Write a protein that binds this ligand. Structure first.
Ligand SMILES: *[C@@H]1O[C@H](CO)[C@@H](O)[C@H](O)[C@H]1NC(C)=O
Ligand SMILES: *[C@@H]1O[C@H](CO)[C@@H](O)[C@H](O)[C@H]1NC(C)=O
Ligand SMILES: *[C@@H]1O[C@H](CO)[C@@H](O)[C@H](O)[C@H]1NC(C)=O
Ligand SMILES: *[C@@H]1O[C@H](CO)[C@@H](O)[C@H](O)[C@H]1NC(C)=O
Ligand SMILES: *[C@@H]1O[C@H](CO)[C@@H](O)[C@H](O)[C@H]1NC(C)=O
Ligand SMILES: *[C@@H]1O[C@H](CO)[C@@H](O)[C@H](O)[C@H]1NC(C)=O
Lengths: 371, 367
């Protein structure tokens, strides 16, 4: 019997927090996992973008005695708990993308979120398939540039002429930006934002008769198809994106169901995000690591009192090597970056019947289209 | 008599800090009071060690911490400073976040959105149609983003590359030479720059066809001797007013205290000059607040700093003529968005001021 850690936003409850609890409870029930063990956990609710509070709440979970911390979903917060985890030798489990640094030499952490250099290369692979010559990439926050940088420096190695814009704070302030694209005849567009931001801008692009067949939008969000695309079914507009969540598999469909069993924004109700799906998978991927390490026993470690974690290098090694078929498909880590650089995607596009798989992608095979 | 804080990777910023408080002590005009300080040497890119060393300086009792010169390290001490209400003094650019609501901090480094707008103002003056922007690390994209999204509002067609090893820049140079990319912007440290110029030279890439612009403000602490009569054009900016002799003599007694790399020996970087100015800009704030007294504050024991909101207010309002010119802060971002630059270019006599710039006036060229 051992304990896990968790840090989530403070507020109604969070979707990642529920995917975490729900995950350890189905690990308890399921015989195959922990036939001689039981998962308990400790939840901490911190105000995000607060490195200090995240570090303290982290140290409280460390003295309490955890085998791994599932840190916050933010840049600053996650970097703090990542450094504390690397110091005291306790594994850090990130479920989102954060800006990494070459200088940084932390090793006690892994990220289940699909390496975003693989996704940027999948996007341009999709632009190659569409034979696009021009394209306007519009991002939400500045980190978007660091994210899909492999796409930004394609025009230098390729024959591409892409403009690049950004949208302000207000959601509905996207109309002026849309006026400039409409006016600039920029029909091929990539959007770097959350599926919520996306559903919001599509509702405005619609008001600006911008949903014709001339336009073709690609989306960064993997939760693209948790969107109510009903209003744009027969508008003639094309839309494409990726999906790492294998909802095609019924095992995944039933898990998503018992999870959803527990407003007019444009989103569909009763859906599981990839952030929630990645937290659920994280719990399972670390459960298979501890499964191969029956001699595990948490320990009370203090931040002020320097003291590495006993079974750290061993546990972290079993985690970076773990291969697990989860909701998001085959899960494996780049031995160098402990970063998930190899994964399977399903390219999907809007049709007159709705969004549907038109092919697959992956860093290896490249781009396979079911013509 | 009060104490200051400092965190560094001896270093040039650390010496500019000590040197700064010692000249504040000597100089009558300031502290007619005495400055003592506490130095901490942390391994950079270590949020944890930076937070602990910071809390040790907080319990010790400081009036302000001059945090580390890194993203992660500076964000940690920035959050701790905002919590315990002690002013944070950053001297470099770090990626800021809209969500972040910390207020106890200011950055003397010139707002990099003003510099990105000065760069394109320079590209407008040169009437460049094409241009290849090559950055060093990924944060460069976030930095000069105001330039990257110019092609959408303007008539510009700029490529964009990244460099990996210093000497591994040759393949990148082959692609530019081959792609006829003569107009080039470089986003890197003056050390990286001096290194790539030495290679561009070996590749007969220093002709009059090429024209390089540089992000580094320490551009002209470079040995540009080998490219004097090569015919190549080179341009950059300078916020350090070495033209002013007061600044020239300070830089001198500084270089009196402390390899074939392409750099010039005995120079003061803008990072060191900004630390020196920081100490003075915060000294003028405490000068207008004689009722100041440091306090021992604990991290585990929540307790804001008494004269925090007041001190931080006197600092964000402080106007000070320093080594880097007039220093003032954007009331909203506590970020130095208004400053004076001196555009400089390589001639047959060497680098020299060919004009000035600033967010207000725009671009003034001494034709
Ligand atoms: C679109 O939005 C405008 C306001 O921006 C509103 O006045 C108009 O009724 C809308 N047009 C339609 C028919 O959707
Ligand atoms: C692992 O990381 C290296 C270096 O970033 C990268 O080149 C490689 O593609 C990654 N591994 C895989 C198979 O994705
Ligand atoms: C440039 O570098 C090459 C390879 O090291 C060297 O052989 C050559 O002499 C250099 N060019 C000159 C003229 O210095
Ligand atoms: C560089 O400067 C000289 C000054 O005479 C100018 O004639 C030339 O056009 C410039 N080089 C470029 C980039 O054209
Ligand atoms: C401060 O920054 C804002 C952008 O955040 C800018 O619009 C404003 O002009 C700056 N303050 C002034 C008036 O100098
Ligand atoms: C242009 O520079 C001159 C000095 O050469 C300066 O006196 C003048 O104020 C500048 N013009 C303006 C106001 O932009």
């Amino acid at each position: 019997v051992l304990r896990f850690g968790g840090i989530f936003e403070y507020v109604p409850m969070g979707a990642e927090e529920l995917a975490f609890r729900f995950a350890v409870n189905t690990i308890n029930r399921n015989r195959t996992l922990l036939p001689n063990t039981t998962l308990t956990y400790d939840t901490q609710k911190i105000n995000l973008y607060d490195s200090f509070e995240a570090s303290k709440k982290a140290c409280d979970q460390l003295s309490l005695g955890v085998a791994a911390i599932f840190g916050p979903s933010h840049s600053s917060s996650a970097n703090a708990v990542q450094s504390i985890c690397n110091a005291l030798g306790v594994p850090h489990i990130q479920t989102r993308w954060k800006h990494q640094v070459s200088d940084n030499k932390d090793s006690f952490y892994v990220s289940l979120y699909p390496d975003f250099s693989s996704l940027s290369r999948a996007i341009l692979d999709l632009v190659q398939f569409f034979k696009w010559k021009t394209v306007t990439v519009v991002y939400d926050d500045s980190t978007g540039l660091i994210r899909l940088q492999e796409l930004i420096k394609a025009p230098s190695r390729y024959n591409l002429r892409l403009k690049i814009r950004q949208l302000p704070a207000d959601t509905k302030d996207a109309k002026p930006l849309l006026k400039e694209m409409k006016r600039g005849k920029e029909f091929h567009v990539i959007f770097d934002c959350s599926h919520e931001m996306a559903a919001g801008i599509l509702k405005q692009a619609l008001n600006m008769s911008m949903m014709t067949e001339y336009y073709h939008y690609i989306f960064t969000t993997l939760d693209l198809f948790a969107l109510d695309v009903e209003p744009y079914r027969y508008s003639g507009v094309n839309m494409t994106g990726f999906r790492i969540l294998n909802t095609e598999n019924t095992q995944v469909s039933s898990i998503i169901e018992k999870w959803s069993m527990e407003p007019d924004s444009g989103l569909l109700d009763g859906f599981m995000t990839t952030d929630a799906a990645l937290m659920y998978d994280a719990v399972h991927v670390v459960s298979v690591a501890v499964q191969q390490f029956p001699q595990m026993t948490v320990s009370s470690l203090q931040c002020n009192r320097h003291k590495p974690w006993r079974f750290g290098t061993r546990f972290m090694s079993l985690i970076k090597e773990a291969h697990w078929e989860g909701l998001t498909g085959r899960i494996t880590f780049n031995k160098t970056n402990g970063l998930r650089t190899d994964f399977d995607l399903d390219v999907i596009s809007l049709k007159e019947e709705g969004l549907e798989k038109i092919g697959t992608w992956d860093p290896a095979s490249g781009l396979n289209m079911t013509e």
